[PDB]
mmCIF file of C-alpha atoms in Angstrom:
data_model
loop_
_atom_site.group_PDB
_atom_site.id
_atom_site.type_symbol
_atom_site.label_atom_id
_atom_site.label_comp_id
_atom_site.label_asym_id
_atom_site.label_seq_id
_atom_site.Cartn_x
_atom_site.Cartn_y
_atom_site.Cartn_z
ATOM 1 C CA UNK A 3 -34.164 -10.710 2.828
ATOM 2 C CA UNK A 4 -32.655 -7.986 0.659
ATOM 3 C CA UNK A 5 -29.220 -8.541 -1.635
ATOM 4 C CA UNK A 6 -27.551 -5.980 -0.033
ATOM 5 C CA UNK A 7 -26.016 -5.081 4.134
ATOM 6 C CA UNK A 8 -28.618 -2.419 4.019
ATOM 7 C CA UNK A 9 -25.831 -0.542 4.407
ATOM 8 C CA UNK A 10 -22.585 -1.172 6.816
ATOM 9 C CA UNK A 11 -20.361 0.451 9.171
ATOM 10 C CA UNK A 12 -17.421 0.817 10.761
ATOM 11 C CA UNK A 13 -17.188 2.937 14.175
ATOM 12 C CA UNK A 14 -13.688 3.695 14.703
ATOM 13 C CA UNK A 15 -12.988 4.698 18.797
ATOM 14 C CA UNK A 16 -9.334 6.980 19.359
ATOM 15 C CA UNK A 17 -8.478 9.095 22.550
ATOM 16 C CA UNK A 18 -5.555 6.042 22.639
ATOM 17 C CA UNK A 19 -2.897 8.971 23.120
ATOM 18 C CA UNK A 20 -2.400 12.633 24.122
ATOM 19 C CA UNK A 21 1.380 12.424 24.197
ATOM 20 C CA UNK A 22 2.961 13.650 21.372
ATOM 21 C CA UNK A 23 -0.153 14.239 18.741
ATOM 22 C CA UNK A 24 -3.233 14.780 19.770
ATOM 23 C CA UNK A 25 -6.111 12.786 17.446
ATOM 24 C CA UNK A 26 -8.967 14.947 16.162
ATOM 25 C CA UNK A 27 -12.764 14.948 18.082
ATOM 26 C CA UNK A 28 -13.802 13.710 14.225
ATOM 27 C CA UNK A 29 -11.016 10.614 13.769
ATOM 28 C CA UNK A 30 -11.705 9.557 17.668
ATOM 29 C CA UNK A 31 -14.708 9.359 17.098
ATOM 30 C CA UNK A 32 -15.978 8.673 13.162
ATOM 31 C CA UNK A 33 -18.472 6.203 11.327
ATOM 32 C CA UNK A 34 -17.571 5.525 8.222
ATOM 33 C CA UNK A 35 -19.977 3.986 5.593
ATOM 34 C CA UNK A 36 -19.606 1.139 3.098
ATOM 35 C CA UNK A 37 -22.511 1.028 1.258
ATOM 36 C CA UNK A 38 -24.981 -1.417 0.154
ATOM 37 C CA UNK A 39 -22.312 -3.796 -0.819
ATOM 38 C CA UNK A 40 -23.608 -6.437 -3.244
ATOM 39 C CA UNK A 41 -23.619 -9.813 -1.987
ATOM 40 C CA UNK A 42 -23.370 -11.379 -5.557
ATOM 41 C CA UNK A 43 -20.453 -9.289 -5.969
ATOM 42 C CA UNK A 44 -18.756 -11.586 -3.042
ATOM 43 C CA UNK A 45 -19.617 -14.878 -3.260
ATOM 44 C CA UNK A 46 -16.008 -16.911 -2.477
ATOM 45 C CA UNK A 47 -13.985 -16.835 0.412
ATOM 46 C CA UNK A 48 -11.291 -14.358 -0.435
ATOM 47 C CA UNK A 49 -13.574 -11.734 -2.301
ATOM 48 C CA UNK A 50 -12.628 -8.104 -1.784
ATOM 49 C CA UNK A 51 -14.514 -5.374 -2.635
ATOM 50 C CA UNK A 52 -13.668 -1.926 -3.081
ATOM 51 C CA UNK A 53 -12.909 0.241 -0.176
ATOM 52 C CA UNK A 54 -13.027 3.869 1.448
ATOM 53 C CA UNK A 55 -10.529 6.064 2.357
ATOM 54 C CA UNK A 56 -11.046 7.326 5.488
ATOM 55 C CA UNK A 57 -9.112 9.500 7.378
ATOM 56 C CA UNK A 58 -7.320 9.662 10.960
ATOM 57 C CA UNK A 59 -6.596 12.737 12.052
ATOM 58 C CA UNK A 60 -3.780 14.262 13.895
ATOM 59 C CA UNK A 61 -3.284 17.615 15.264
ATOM 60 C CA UNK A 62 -0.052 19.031 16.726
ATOM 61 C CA UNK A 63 1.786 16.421 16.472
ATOM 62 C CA UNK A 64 5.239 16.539 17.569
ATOM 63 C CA UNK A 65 8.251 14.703 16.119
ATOM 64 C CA UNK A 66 10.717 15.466 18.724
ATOM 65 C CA UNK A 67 9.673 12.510 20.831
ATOM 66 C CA UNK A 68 8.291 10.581 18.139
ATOM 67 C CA UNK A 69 8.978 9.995 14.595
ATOM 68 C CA UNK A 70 6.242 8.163 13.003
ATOM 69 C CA UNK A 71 2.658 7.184 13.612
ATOM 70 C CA UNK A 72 1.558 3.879 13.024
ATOM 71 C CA UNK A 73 -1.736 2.460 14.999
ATOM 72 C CA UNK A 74 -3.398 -0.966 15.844
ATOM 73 C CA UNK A 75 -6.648 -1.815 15.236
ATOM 74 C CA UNK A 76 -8.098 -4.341 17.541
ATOM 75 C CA UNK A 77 -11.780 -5.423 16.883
ATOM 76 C CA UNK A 78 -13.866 -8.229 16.570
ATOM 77 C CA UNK A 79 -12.060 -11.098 14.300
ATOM 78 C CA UNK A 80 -14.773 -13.141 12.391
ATOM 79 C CA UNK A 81 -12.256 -16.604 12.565
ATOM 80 C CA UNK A 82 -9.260 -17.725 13.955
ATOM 81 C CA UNK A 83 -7.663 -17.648 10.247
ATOM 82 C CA UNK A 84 -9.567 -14.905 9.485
ATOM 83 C CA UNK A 85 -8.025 -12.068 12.370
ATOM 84 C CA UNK A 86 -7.730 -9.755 9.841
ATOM 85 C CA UNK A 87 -11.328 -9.040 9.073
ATOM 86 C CA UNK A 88 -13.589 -7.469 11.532
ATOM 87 C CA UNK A 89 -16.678 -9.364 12.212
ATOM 88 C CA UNK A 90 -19.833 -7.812 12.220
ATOM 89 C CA UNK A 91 -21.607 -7.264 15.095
ATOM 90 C CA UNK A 92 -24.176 -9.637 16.030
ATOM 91 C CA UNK A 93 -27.733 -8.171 17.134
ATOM 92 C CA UNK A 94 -29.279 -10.901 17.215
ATOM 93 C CA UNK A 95 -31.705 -9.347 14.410
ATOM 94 C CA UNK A 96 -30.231 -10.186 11.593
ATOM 95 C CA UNK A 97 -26.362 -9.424 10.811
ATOM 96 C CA UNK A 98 -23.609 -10.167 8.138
ATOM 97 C CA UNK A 99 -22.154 -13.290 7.124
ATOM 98 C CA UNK A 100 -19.708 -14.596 4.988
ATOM 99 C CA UNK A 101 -18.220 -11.371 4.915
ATOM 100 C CA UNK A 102 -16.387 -8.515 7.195
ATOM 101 C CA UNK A 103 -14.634 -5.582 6.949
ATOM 102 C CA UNK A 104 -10.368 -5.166 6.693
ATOM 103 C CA UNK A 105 -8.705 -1.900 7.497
ATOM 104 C CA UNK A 106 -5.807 -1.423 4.888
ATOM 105 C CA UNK A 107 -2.919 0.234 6.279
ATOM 106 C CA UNK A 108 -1.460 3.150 4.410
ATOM 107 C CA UNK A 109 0.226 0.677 1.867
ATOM 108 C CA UNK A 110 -2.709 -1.357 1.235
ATOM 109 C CA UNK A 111 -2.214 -3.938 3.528
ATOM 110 C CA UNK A 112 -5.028 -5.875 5.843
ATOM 111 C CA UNK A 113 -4.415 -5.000 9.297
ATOM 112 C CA UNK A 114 -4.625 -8.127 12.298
ATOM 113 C CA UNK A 115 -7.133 -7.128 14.666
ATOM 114 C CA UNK A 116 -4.383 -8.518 17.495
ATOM 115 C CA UNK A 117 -4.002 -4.996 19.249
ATOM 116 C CA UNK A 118 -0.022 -4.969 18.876
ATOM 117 C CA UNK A 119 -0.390 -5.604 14.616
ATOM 118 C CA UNK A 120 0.654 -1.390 14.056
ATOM 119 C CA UNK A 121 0.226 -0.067 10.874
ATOM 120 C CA UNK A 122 2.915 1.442 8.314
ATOM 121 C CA UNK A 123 5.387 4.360 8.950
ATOM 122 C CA UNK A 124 3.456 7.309 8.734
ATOM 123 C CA UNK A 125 6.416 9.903 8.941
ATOM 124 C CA UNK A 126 5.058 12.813 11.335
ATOM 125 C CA UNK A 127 5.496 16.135 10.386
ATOM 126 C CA UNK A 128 5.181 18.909 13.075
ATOM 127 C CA UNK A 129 1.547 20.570 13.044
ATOM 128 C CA UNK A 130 -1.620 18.716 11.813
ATOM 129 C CA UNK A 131 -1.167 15.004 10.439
ATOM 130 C CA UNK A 132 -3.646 12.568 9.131
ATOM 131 C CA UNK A 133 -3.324 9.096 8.419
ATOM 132 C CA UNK A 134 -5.378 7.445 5.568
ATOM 133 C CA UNK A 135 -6.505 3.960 5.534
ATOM 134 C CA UNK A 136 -8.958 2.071 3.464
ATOM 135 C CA UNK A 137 -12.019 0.006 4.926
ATOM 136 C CA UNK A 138 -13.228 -2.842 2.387
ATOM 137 C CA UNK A 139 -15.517 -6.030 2.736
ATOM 138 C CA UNK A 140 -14.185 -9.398 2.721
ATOM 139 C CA UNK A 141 -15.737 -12.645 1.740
ATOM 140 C CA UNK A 142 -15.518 -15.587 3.825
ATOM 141 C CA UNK A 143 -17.961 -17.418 1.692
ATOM 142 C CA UNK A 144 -21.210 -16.072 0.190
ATOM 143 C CA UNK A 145 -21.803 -12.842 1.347
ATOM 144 C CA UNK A 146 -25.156 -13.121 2.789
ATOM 145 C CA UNK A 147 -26.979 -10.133 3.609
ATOM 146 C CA UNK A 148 -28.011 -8.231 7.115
ATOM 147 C CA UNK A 149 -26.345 -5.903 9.560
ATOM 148 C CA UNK A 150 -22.565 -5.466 8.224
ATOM 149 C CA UNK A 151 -21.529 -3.228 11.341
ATOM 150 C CA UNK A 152 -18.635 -3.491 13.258
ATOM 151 C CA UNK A 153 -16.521 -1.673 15.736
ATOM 152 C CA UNK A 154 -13.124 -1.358 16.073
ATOM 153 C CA UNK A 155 -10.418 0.390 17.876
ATOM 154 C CA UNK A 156 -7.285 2.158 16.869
ATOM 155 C CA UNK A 157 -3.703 2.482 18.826
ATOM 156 C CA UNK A 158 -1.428 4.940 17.150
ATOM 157 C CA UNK A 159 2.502 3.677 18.272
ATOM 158 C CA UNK A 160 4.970 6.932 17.501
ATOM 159 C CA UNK A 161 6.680 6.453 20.830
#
């Protein structure tokens, strides 16, 4: 096989709320790549590489009944101790192991794929809002290479 994921992504899915911001047709709906990550470059459980910034996007967002955004991402966890990384998707036909994907909340922090873990206070500011976060790999061994795609789900909380 090759050294590298061929490539991975992560498929982020919105449309979670209309209330008081709407999220953009891009950010409910957005595959972000990683790369060919290097599976030398991970080969202990605990090795982070370096991530994306990708971007959710708000528009008309109001702040009178909320304050700030600050979403859940629930996807596939790769171990019990290990709810924090997204797994990647088995096909059957050869995915990723050893390794997964974390979503870093606006401070830089791995996000639990539990579906009530909420990100950071992103303060909301009336009009168009966007909330960054950064997608990485994690090691939970040797990265070993194949299909490093994985899905996963966002709930914004600003009410």
């Amino acid at each position: 096989a090759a050294t590298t994921v061929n490539g991975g992504t992560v498929h982020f899915k919105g449309e979670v709320v209309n209330a008081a911001c709407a999220v953009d047709a891009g950010s409910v709906d957005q595959t972000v790549q990683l790369g060919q990550v290097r599976t030398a470059s991970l080969a202990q459980e605990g090795a982070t590489s370096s991530a994306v910034g990708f971007n959710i996007q708000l528009n008309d967002c109001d702040t009178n009944v909320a304050s700030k955004a600050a979403v859940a991402f629930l996807g596939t966890a790769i171990d019990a101790g290990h709810t924090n990384v997204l797994a990647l998707q088995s096909s059957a036909a050869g995915s990723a192991t050893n390794v997964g994907v974390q979503i870093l909340d606006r401070t830089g922090a791995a996000l639990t794929l539990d579906g009530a873990t909420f990100s950071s206070e992103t303060t909301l500011n009336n009009g168009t809002n966007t909330i960054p976060f950064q997608a990485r790999y994690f090691a939970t061994g040797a990265a070993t290479p194949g299909a490093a795609n994985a899905d996963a789900t966002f709930k914004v909380q600003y009410q």
